[PDB]
């Protein structure tokens, strides 16, 4: 089956171990929605957290 996923609208990264780094246009697999403001997702087997408003959902969780 197709995994939940989203397209990055903007670049993101951070200095916390858990921040997911990505560029605008990247396709991110969604793994968990922490709260209204944060997802856990992954790109290329690298996991981390990022803001919900920085992506456009393709397939929801």
Coordinates of C-alpha atoms in Angstrom, one line a residue:
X1 CA 0.0 0.0 0.0
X2 CA 1.0 3.7 -0.5
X3 CA 2.4 5.2 2.7
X4 CA 1.1 8.5 4.0
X5 CA 3.1 11.3 2.6
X6 CA 3.4 15.0 1.9
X7 CA 5.3 17.5 -0.3
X8 CA 7.5 20.1 1.4
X9 CA 6.3 23.7 0.7
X10 CA 9.5 25.3 2.2
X11 CA 13.0 24.3 3.4
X12 CA 13.3 23.1 7.0
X13 CA 16.1 22.0 9.3
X14 CA 17.2 22.5 12.9
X15 CA 20.0 21.8 15.4
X16 CA 18.0 19.3 17.6
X17 CA 18.9 15.6 17.1
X18 CA 15.2 14.9 16.2
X19 CA 14.8 17.7 13.5
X20 CA 14.2 16.4 10.0
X21 CA 16.1 18.4 7.3
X22 CA 14.4 18.8 3.9
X23 CA 14.1 21.1 0.9
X24 CA 11.1 22.6 -0.8
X25 CA 9.6 19.9 -3.1
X26 CA 10.9 16.9 -1.2
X27 CA 8.4 14.1 -0.7
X28 CA 8.2 13.1 3.0
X29 CA 6.7 9.9 4.4
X30 CA 4.5 10.7 7.4
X31 CA 4.9 8.4 10.4
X32 CA 3.0 10.2 13.3
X33 CA 1.3 13.5 14.0
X34 CA 2.5 14.6 17.5
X35 CA 0.0 17.4 17.8
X36 CA -1.6 20.2 15.6
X37 CA 1.9 21.7 14.9
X38 CA 4.3 18.7 14.5
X39 CA 4.8 15.6 12.4
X40 CA 7.3 12.8 12.7
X41 CA 8.3 11.8 9.1
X42 CA 11.1 10.4 7.1
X43 CA 13.1 11.0 3.9
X44 CA 15.5 8.2 2.6
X45 CA 15.3 6.3 5.9
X46 CA 16.2 9.4 8.0
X47 CA 13.6 10.3 10.6
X48 CA 12.7 13.4 12.4
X49 CA 10.2 16.1 13.3
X50 CA 9.0 19.1 11.4
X51 CA 6.1 21.7 11.3
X52 CA 2.8 20.5 10.0
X53 CA 2.3 23.8 8.0
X54 CA 5.6 23.3 6.1
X55 CA 4.1 20.5 3.9
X56 CA 1.1 19.9 1.7
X57 CA -0.5 16.5 2.5
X58 CA -0.6 14.0 -0.4
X59 CA -1.9 11.0 1.5
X60 CA -3.0 11.6 5.2
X61 CA -2.1 9.4 8.1

